[PDB]
PDB file of C-alpha atoms in Angstrom:
ATOM      1  CA  UNK A   1      18.830  29.358  58.004  1.00 47.57           C
ATOM      2  CA  UNK A   2      17.511  31.891  55.496  1.00 46.23           C
ATOM      3  CA  UNK A   3      20.072  30.811  52.891  1.00 42.47           C
ATOM      4  CA  UNK A   4      19.954  29.862  49.227  1.00 38.97           C
ATOM      5  CA  UNK A   5      19.629  26.098  49.633  1.00 37.19           C
ATOM      6  CA  UNK A   6      18.823  25.796  45.932  1.00 39.14           C
ATOM      7  CA  UNK A   7      22.022  27.614  44.982  1.00 36.37           C
ATOM      8  CA  UNK A   8      24.709  24.901  44.264  1.00 36.58           C
ATOM      9  CA  UNK A   9      27.245  27.226  45.883  1.00 39.06           C
ATOM     10  CA  UNK A  10      25.588  26.825  49.279  1.00 39.25           C
ATOM     11  CA  UNK A  11      25.585  23.040  48.958  1.00 36.91           C
ATOM     12  CA  UNK A  12      29.192  23.067  47.763  1.00 38.34           C
ATOM     13  CA  UNK A  13      30.204  25.319  50.652  1.00 36.43           C
ATOM     14  CA  UNK A  14      28.735  22.845  53.130  1.00 36.02           C
ATOM     15  CA  UNK A  15      30.792  20.048  51.584  1.00 34.18           C
ATOM     16  CA  UNK A  16      34.055  22.001  51.815  1.00 34.31           C
ATOM     17  CA  UNK A  17      33.560  22.727  55.509  1.00 33.39           C
ATOM     18  CA  UNK A  18      32.511  19.142  56.217  1.00 32.30           C
ATOM     19  CA  UNK A  19      35.355  17.724  54.137  1.00 31.90           C
ATOM     20  CA  UNK A  20      37.850  19.884  55.994  1.00 31.44           C
ATOM     21  CA  UNK A  21      36.202  19.036  59.315  1.00 33.44           C
ATOM     22  CA  UNK A  22      36.543  15.301  58.718  1.00 38.15           C
ATOM     23  CA  UNK A  23      40.202  15.750  57.751  1.00 38.55           C
ATOM     24  CA  UNK A  24      40.744  17.965  60.789  1.00 37.75           C
ATOM     25  CA  UNK A  25      39.598  15.208  63.139  1.00 35.87           C
ATOM     26  CA  UNK A  26      41.897  12.705  61.425  1.00 35.73           C
ATOM     27  CA  UNK A  27      44.876  15.021  61.882  1.00 36.11           C
ATOM     28  CA  UNK A  28      44.160  15.278  65.604  1.00 36.96           C
ATOM     29  CA  UNK A  29      44.161  11.490  65.939  1.00 36.78           C
ATOM     30  CA  UNK A  30      47.116  11.337  63.552  1.00 35.30           C
ATOM     31  CA  UNK A  31      50.476  10.196  64.924  1.00 36.12           C
ATOM     32  CA  UNK A  32      54.064  10.867  63.861  1.00 38.50           C
ATOM     33  CA  UNK A  33      54.462   7.092  63.663  1.00 40.27           C
TER      34      UNK A  33
ATOM     35  CA  UNK B   1      55.754  35.600  43.242  1.00 40.10           C
ATOM     36  CA  UNK B   2      53.545  35.783  46.339  1.00 40.85           C
ATOM     37  CA  UNK B   3      49.801  35.130  46.138  1.00 40.64           C
ATOM     38  CA  UNK B   4      47.054  35.539  48.741  1.00 40.39           C
ATOM     39  CA  UNK B   5      45.967  32.808  51.159  1.00 42.28           C
ATOM     40  CA  UNK B   6      43.391  30.036  50.738  1.00 45.10           C
ATOM     41  CA  UNK B   7      42.042  30.910  54.165  1.00 49.08           C
ATOM     42  CA  UNK B   8      39.705  33.312  52.407  1.00 51.86           C
ATOM     43  CA  UNK B   9      38.431  30.397  50.319  1.00 51.83           C
ATOM     44  CA  UNK B  10      37.315  28.529  53.435  1.00 51.74           C
ATOM     45  CA  UNK B  11      35.759  31.695  54.868  1.00 49.63           C
ATOM     46  CA  UNK B  12      33.632  32.112  51.753  1.00 54.13           C
ATOM     47  CA  UNK B  13      31.995  28.821  52.678  1.00 56.02           C
ATOM     48  CA  UNK B  14      31.082  30.365  56.042  1.00 53.73           C
ATOM     49  CA  UNK B  15      30.151  33.799  54.673  1.00 51.99           C
ATOM     50  CA  UNK B  16      27.322  31.952  52.940  1.00 51.49           C
ATOM     51  CA  UNK B  17      25.659  31.471  56.323  1.00 52.46           C
ATOM     52  CA  UNK B  18      26.688  34.927  57.579  1.00 50.46           C
ATOM     53  CA  UNK B  19      23.980  36.895  55.770  1.00 47.05           C
ATOM     54  CA  UNK B  20      24.260  39.607  58.401  1.00 46.64           C
ATOM     55  CA  UNK B  21      27.933  40.125  57.581  1.00 45.53           C
ATOM     56  CA  UNK B  22      28.691  40.677  61.269  1.00 47.33           C
ATOM     57  CA  UNK B  23      31.340  37.945  61.365  1.00 48.31           C
ATOM     58  CA  UNK B  24      28.987  35.408  62.953  1.00 44.75           C
ATOM     59  CA  UNK B  25      26.546  32.726  61.819  1.00 43.17           C
ATOM     60  CA  UNK B  26      23.572  31.311  63.714  1.00 42.58           C
ATOM     61  CA  UNK B  27      24.616  28.184  65.603  1.00 44.53           C
ATOM     62  CA  UNK B  28      21.272  26.483  64.899  1.00 45.22           C
ATOM     63  CA  UNK B  29      21.615  26.687  61.098  1.00 44.76           C
ATOM     64  CA  UNK B  30      25.043  25.108  61.406  1.00 47.72           C
ATOM     65  CA  UNK B  31      23.527  21.929  62.794  1.00 44.54           C
ATOM     66  CA  UNK B  32      21.024  21.668  59.940  1.00 46.18           C
ATOM     67  CA  UNK B  33      23.717  22.605  57.435  1.00 43.78           C
ATOM     68  CA  UNK B  34      26.106  19.978  58.829  1.00 42.34           C
ATOM     69  CA  UNK B  35      23.374  17.334  58.968  1.00 41.80           C
ATOM     70  CA  UNK B  36      21.335  18.404  55.921  1.00 42.69           C
ATOM     71  CA  UNK B  37      23.873  19.877  53.464  1.00 42.01           C
ATOM     72  CA  UNK B  38      26.934  18.068  52.096  1.00 47.08           C
ATOM     73  CA  UNK B  39      27.697  14.503  53.288  1.00 47.70           C
ATOM     74  CA  UNK B  40      25.453  14.531  56.348  1.00 46.62           C
ATOM     75  CA  UNK B  41      27.336  14.416  59.667  1.00 45.60           C
ATOM     76  CA  UNK B  42      26.347  12.179  62.585  1.00 44.37           C
ATOM     77  CA  UNK B  43      25.169  13.456  65.966  1.00 46.66           C
ATOM     78  CA  UNK B  44      28.544  12.549  67.448  1.00 45.60           C
ATOM     79  CA  UNK B  45      30.276  14.594  64.761  1.00 45.41           C
ATOM     80  CA  UNK B  46      27.780  17.443  65.145  1.00 45.28           C
ATOM     81  CA  UNK B  47      28.062  17.484  68.949  1.00 45.94           C
ATOM     82  CA  UNK B  48      31.843  17.753  68.750  1.00 45.83           C
ATOM     83  CA  UNK B  49      31.397  20.603  66.278  1.00 45.79           C
ATOM     84  CA  UNK B  50      28.908  22.359  68.587  1.00 46.88           C
ATOM     85  CA  UNK B  51      31.306  22.240  71.531  1.00 48.77           C
ATOM     86  CA  UNK B  52      33.805  23.998  69.286  1.00 47.08           C
ATOM     87  CA  UNK B  53      31.224  26.118  67.436  1.00 47.82           C
ATOM     88  CA  UNK B  54      30.444  28.245  70.545  1.00 45.40           C
ATOM     89  CA  UNK B  55      26.860  28.394  71.786  1.00 46.05           C
ATOM     90  CA  UNK B  56      28.133  29.509  75.176  1.00 43.58           C
ATOM     91  CA  UNK B  57      24.713  31.045  75.693  1.00 41.57           C
ATOM     92  CA  UNK B  58      24.246  33.452  72.787  1.00 40.08           C
ATOM     93  CA  UNK B  59      22.953  31.067  70.113  1.00 39.40           C
ATOM     94  CA  UNK B  60      25.479  32.358  67.555  1.00 38.09           C
ATOM     95  CA  UNK B  61      28.721  30.964  66.152  1.00 35.80           C
ATOM     96  CA  UNK B  62      31.827  32.786  64.985  1.00 36.30           C
ATOM     97  CA  UNK B  63      33.190  31.052  61.879  1.00 34.69           C
ATOM     98  CA  UNK B  64      36.515  32.594  62.861  1.00 35.66           C
ATOM     99  CA  UNK B  65      37.203  29.836  65.408  1.00 32.60           C
ATOM    100  CA  UNK B  66      36.243  27.150  62.885  1.00 30.05           C
ATOM    101  CA  UNK B  67      38.699  28.683  60.444  1.00 29.19           C
ATOM    102  CA  UNK B  68      41.427  28.706  63.069  1.00 25.82           C
ATOM    103  CA  UNK B  69      40.917  25.001  63.705  1.00 24.16           C
ATOM    104  CA  UNK B  70      41.055  24.480  59.952  1.00 24.58           C
ATOM    105  CA  UNK B  71      44.216  26.606  59.875  1.00 25.04           C
ATOM    106  CA  UNK B  72      45.711  25.533  63.212  1.00 23.53           C
ATOM    107  CA  UNK B  73      47.104  22.088  62.405  1.00 21.78           C
TER     108      UNK B  73
END
């Protein structure tokens, strides 16, 4: 890893990717109707 | 009028793991990061991510592809 785990920015960055990832999967399974 | 793109915002989140600044991040740290940092992901979620992350046989991941998925829908 070798990253600033303590730095809130790192933790926040992880959330953004994960949040987007979860939404990404939903879009794939999403249907026009 | 016209402003930049938010794509850079998402990349910043990846650049955090790309300490080398070569455009790639270690695949192994991704797993820990996705299971240890921010709403922990499940193995099923992580495995799906790994198949898309890369790890063809180099042990590194290009956040570029992840961004494309995030910007290809």
